[PDB]
Amino acid sequence: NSMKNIESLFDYSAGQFEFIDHLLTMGVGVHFAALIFFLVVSQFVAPKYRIATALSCIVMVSAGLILNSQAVMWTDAYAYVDGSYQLQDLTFSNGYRYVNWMATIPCLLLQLLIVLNLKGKELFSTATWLILAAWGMIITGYVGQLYEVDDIAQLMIWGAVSTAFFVVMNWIVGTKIFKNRATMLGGTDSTITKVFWLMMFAWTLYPIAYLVPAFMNNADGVVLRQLLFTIADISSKVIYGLMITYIAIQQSAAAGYVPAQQALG
Ligand SMILES: CCCCCCCC/C=C\CCCCCCCC(=O)OC[C@H](O)CO
Ligand SMILES: CCCCCCCC/C=C\CCCCCCCC(=O)OC[C@H](O)CO
Ligand SMILES: *C\C=C(C)/C=C/C=C(C)/C=C/C1=C(C)CCCC1(C)C
Ligand SMILES: CCCCCCCC/C=C\CCCCCCCC(=O)O
Ligand SMILES: CCCCCCCC/C=C\CCCCCCCC(=O)O
Ligand SMILES: CCCCCCCC/C=C\CCCCCCCC(=O)O
Ligand SMILES: [Cl-]
Secondary structure (H helix, E strand, O other): OOOOOOHHOOOOOOOHHHHHHHHHHHHHHHHHHHHHHHHHHHHHOOOOHHHHHHHHHHHHHHHHHHHHHHHHHHHHHHHHHHHHHHEEOOOOOOOOHHHHHHHHHHHHHHHHHOOOOHHHHHHHHHHHHHHHHHHHHHHHHHHHOOEEEEEEEHHHHHHHHHHHHHHHHHHHHHHHHOHHHHHHHOOOOHHHHHHHEEEEEHHHHHHHHHHHHHHHOOHHHHHHHHHHHHHHHHHHHHHHHHHHHHOOOOOOOHHHHHHHHHHHO
């Protein structure tokens, strides 16, 4: 997993290396700061939607820990020798991000179905096919990135299969959204449409980072990839969670829940 990724192939100047480390540690503070927000505001959510904010708290920490682990692993592996940071130990890899995706993605999707006001049979059903679709996407994508150094052909083929799941996944998401927004309260039938387009954008940065080894196989591609993941993380997890929370609170007010009615006031 360490020799299979392109990061183990290049030396990095002090600028490139300190910039990556600063990206990873910044994502930590952003997520753990967001955690405190999602934690505090969960009281302003009616019980019907409160799980939606608790799932954001889980994502914030699941991502913050992996990011924090990525930073420490980033430093342990490289040592400044003769004007450039050089690989010293095989401990860094992007594979740990994919494991973070197996957990955060089901949490990001489940809280979307909760603000849409699904329940019972359809919730457990729609939730089962989206996760198995996301898992199939994450796994096929994990196998392909194991060849981002040896077999680029395999990366493409596995990337194609992973994209097949991605398309099917979003098709189910969009279908459920536009077939259930009329049920949403407080005027959130418009906000949920915006969250969807936020989804379609942020989630599409990952496959672009997945392909950086194919069109920019250099140290500046390693920096571009992490910069892409950083933009994607902050949008698919933080901003996405803020919109989900705003929707959760808004409907809580419309339903007559006072802590949300006084919070928005
Ligand atoms: C040889 C390797 C095997 C190739 C196979 C891997 C490719 C999978 C892609 C599409 C089919 C799977 C998706 C089919 C989804 C049908 C179920 C569904 O979508 O229903 C959900 C519903 O909208 C909510 O209740
Ligand atoms: C490896 C490449 C394989 C080929 C893949 C490339 C082709 C992509 C085509 C469509 C994307 C669909 C994205 C999902 C967009 C949301 C669709 C939706 O919301 O559902 C329709 C709705 O019911 C209407 O009102
Ligand atoms: C941290 C949050 C999320 C939603 C991570 C999401 C990742 C993806 C949607 C990755 C998608 C890929 C596809 C479409 C095909 C190439 C390989 C990937 C797994 C990177
Ligand atoms: C309520 C407080 C909100 C902010 C959360 C706490 C802020 C923590 C700040 C930095 C993250 C700590 C982990 C980064 C490690 C830095 C050293 C390294 O490069 O590995
Ligand atoms: C591969 C694993 C498939 C998982 C299937 C989906 C499981 C989702 C089950 C529900 C978890 C969230 C429960 C929150 C519901 C809130 C509504 C209520 O309070 O009754
Ligand atoms: C660690 C928990 C794993 C959970 C797996 C359950 C989800 C399975 C979904 C579809 C898997 C499709 C990927 C094909 C596997 C072959 C790739 C390989 O050889 O490693
Ligand atoms: Cl991530």
